[model samples]
Target: EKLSPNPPKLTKQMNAIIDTVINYKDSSGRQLSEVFIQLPSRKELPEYYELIRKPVDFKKIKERIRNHKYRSLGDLEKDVMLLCHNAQTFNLEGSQIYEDSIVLQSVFKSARQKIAKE
Candidate 1:
């Protein structure tokens, strides 16, 4: 009988993309799927926090937060939550709901919590 060696280590990059989608309903409240990918950066840290918005301009979005250098997933998660805090808003009139705002904010929150727990 021959002994088997330990399995080789995994070297693949396993980055998960968190998506934020907003669904506009018809009279029957139909659901739609809109996904936004987390912009990829090569910097050691996050630059700024503008790319979180829709029709996101990646250049400016990246430029604004390039100053902050992050080396780990924890740093990225915290920075993302900070961005969400800046983006979530409500109208003083309070006549309608901003579903997208909720989506962005909560997505960040979920990401933050998951990273912290891990």
Candidate 2:
């Protein structure tokens, strides 16, 4: 018999967050789906970059997060929740949602760091 490798472990907080997102449903009745939560692999990044016609950059991050795009952490959280819901609803193929998740993470992380420094 062949032995199987152990699965990757998640931290408690990570697990809790995952549970919350998976369980959450909006007024429109959209619940999170696997397609919404799955991120693109490093190997997939190049393809998405090509589609967008540029590699990820600080300028692009700044463009997205500026203009009161997110007034607070709660607002950002709401946006992410909606993004997941929309991706699950609209993405017929996995590609659109996967790329969106990457862009969302990049914008959110950059905004978070900028806020922290202020």
Candidate 3:
């Protein structure tokens, strides 16, 4: 999807999206971001790298933004979505991690609307 047509507006809005996502507090007021800032423990989730070819987390996404590695708006969205995708794949639907993946999707959707606007 396209980002804000206005470059300055897009930069402002994109940063806003990252800020909200990184500091997002749940209904219980817990920051869910803590769980996704980095990769899961290798000993805890050794199968992760094997299961998902593309491993993504907020650190990577946020860093990519800082470095301006993303070329298109869709590319940025895909990485965040990929983070959720990997989360779902490695975690069971019954687990909290899996549940959090859905939460991330909702978070992204809400923030994405801001960029979608003119």
Best by lDDT: 3
Q: Give the poorly placed runs of model 3, Cα more than 4 Å off.
A: 1-8, 41-44
lDDT of 3 by residue, 1-118 (tens): 3443436665666677877777888779988778888998779888887899988889889788776777656678888888989888888887987887788778887888865674
Query: What TM-scores do the predictions have?
Result: 0.32, 0.30, 0.83
Tens-place lDDT per residue, model 1, 1-118, is: 1333212121000022123222333356643223222433536324333333332322333333343333443544454444434333312233222344455556555644654456
Ranking of models by lDDT: 3, 2, 1
Cα error, residue 18 of model 3, in Å, equals 1.6
For 1-118, candidate 2 gives per-residue lDDT tens digits of 1333212231222233334444444467755344444445558654543443223332222333444444444554565645544454444556754555555554455554554445
Q: How high is the CA lDDT of each candidate model?
A: 0.36, 0.44, 0.79
Ranking by TM-score: 3, 1, 2
Report the candidate with higher TM-score, 1 versus 3.
3
Q: Which of the numbered candidates is closest to the native, going by highest TM-score?
A: 3
Question: Residue 118 lDDT in model 3?
Answer: 43
Candidate 3, after superposition: displacement of residue 86 in Å?
Answer: 0.1
